[PDB]
A and B are shown apart, each in its own frame.
Chain A
Amino acid sequence: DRLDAALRFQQEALNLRAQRQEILAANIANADTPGYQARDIDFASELKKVMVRGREETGGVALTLTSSHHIPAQAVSSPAVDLLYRVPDQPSLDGNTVDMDRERTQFADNSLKYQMGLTVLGSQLKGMMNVLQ
């Protein structure tokens, strides 16, 4: 349309912020497992990729939609974002490269920027509703 072409950018950015959010919480949750190799993604490059290409999430298949009572089930799905390794400091004898301070400052930053995106969408949508009344 032309309603979801002007709000598209903030919608995509905010969804990408949520995706990076559960990536970072997977970093946090695996704080003390051995050999974890903390992951992260590049937000700017991935956002440009999303705007140019689309979603194109890779890997996921649900069952079919026959008559009712056929037990829906789904495969393991993952966004098409290419997970990047976080360059570690302080080797730790168990491979776990999850630094609490790095992961946690990134978590707080990502949270704040997600809230900023929510504010921007709220402003744009309130503007639309203020025009139409």
Chain B
Amino acid sequence: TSEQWLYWLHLYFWPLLRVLALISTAPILSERAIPKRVKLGLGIMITLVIAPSLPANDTPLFSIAALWLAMQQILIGIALGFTMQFAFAAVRTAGEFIGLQMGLSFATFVDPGSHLNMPVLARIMDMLAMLLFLTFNGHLWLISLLVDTFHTLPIGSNPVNSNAFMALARAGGLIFLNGLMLALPVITLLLTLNLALGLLNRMAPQLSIFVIGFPLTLTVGIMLMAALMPLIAPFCEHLFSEIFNLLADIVSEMPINN
């Protein structure tokens, strides 16, 4: 219990720091609903299971010259959790743009301090994707990849290489790509509807989409997205797997590149 331990209690601190970074940044782990004590205790109580079989020996220098080590762990956590947010942003884009088609957002068109559309359709699909994530192996693969980072990039004087934050920067990237690739059928069908009801204006310029168009397009959008709700379930697979691969890639890109 002395420093014969209490500097071997320096075995817990760095892995705890990395696990805590991931928890504070991860998609499900870092939700404001969880009491802060639960997240902290989960970090401590994961590292206690992972800390043995982690041969770590460093020093919390006074006026830390090894804070650049602490940085390292924090950064790796930011790598793992935050990137997994891209998969949600995608749908939080897709569904949002779907509203931007029907009628829901003409307040956001010509000008304000109130957006009012984030509550409407983006939070439908984003929490639907929340559940799709969790239902696997959602909560867990992030933690397993964190342990894998412990084993591939444990603790070192060369923590992070350049040319490797572009990977995450131009990664999304696939935020726009996948948001589209999901919302494309709905957008295309409502484009057809909008152009058709516009062509009605050729027979009579009085038909006034404000009067005719919006009630039609709202029903079309609601019914159609009801019909194309299940299409998300396969897409989320993609939407997570590829991003995992990216993380996996960078996690396994870093050791052979160091």
Within 8 A of B (CB), among A32-60: none
Please indicate the chain A residues that have their CB under 8 angstroms from the CB of B59 in the complex. 1
Would you call B61 an interface residue if the criterion is a C-beta within 8 Å of the partner chain's C-beta atoms? Answer: yes
Bound Cα distance A3, B10 (Å): 14
Please indicate the chain B residues that have their CB under 8 angstroms from the CB of A3 in the complex. 60-62
List the A residue with the shortest CB-CB distance to B66. A1
List the B residue with the shortest CB-CB distance to A7. B62
Nearest Cβ in chain B — how far from A68, in angstroms? 18
Bound Cα distance A1, B60 (Å): 7
Bound Cα distance A2, B59 (Å): 9
Please indicate the chain B residues that have their CB under 8 angstroms from the CB of A1 in the complex. 59-62
Interface size on B, residues (CB 8 A): 5
Bound Cα distance A105, B131 (Å): 79
Would you call A87 an interface residue if the criterion is a C-beta within 8 Å of the partner chain's C-beta atoms? Answer: no
Would you call A6 an interface residue if the criterion is a C-beta within 8 Å of the partner chain's C-beta atoms? Answer: yes
Interface size on A, residues (CB 8 A): 5
- B 40-67 binary contact with A (CB < 8 Å = 1; else 0): 0000000000000000000111110000
- A 1-30 binary contact with B (CB < 8 Å = 1; else 0): 111011000000000000000000000000
- A 89-121 binary contact with B (CB < 8 Å = 1; else 0): 000000000000000000000000000000000
List the A residue with the shortest CB-CB distance to B62. A2
Bound Cα distance A6, B60 (Å): 14
Nearest Cβ in chain A — how far from B2, in angstroms? 13
Please indicate the chain A residues that have their CB under 8 angstroms from the CB of B61 in the complex. 1-3
List the B residue with the shortest CB-CB distance to A128. B62
Please indicate the chain B residues that have their CB under 8 angstroms from the CB of A2 in the complex. 61-63
Nearest Cβ in chain B — how far from A8, in angstroms? 12
Bound Cα distance A3, B60 (Å): 9
Bound Cα distance A1, B61 (Å): 5
Please indicate the chain A residues that have their CB under 8 angstroms from the CB of B60 in the complex. 1, 3
Nearest Cβ in chain B — how far from A77, in angstroms? 17
Bound Cα distance A6, B61 (Å): 12
- The chain A residues found within 8 Å of chain B, CB to CB, are 1-3, 5-6
12 A–B contacts, CB within 8 A, in A order: A1-B59, A1-B60, A1-B61, A1-B62, A2-B61, A2-B62, A2-B63, A3-B60, A3-B61, A3-B62, A5-B62, A6-B62
The 8 closest A-B pairs by CB, nearest first: A2-B62, A3-B62, A1-B59, A2-B61, A1-B61, A1-B62, A2-B63, A1-B60
Besides the known contacts A1-B62, A2-B62, 10 further A-B residue pairs in the complex with CB atoms under 8 A apart: A1-B59, A1-B60, A1-B61, A2-B61, A2-B63, A3-B60, A3-B61, A3-B62, A5-B62, A6-B62
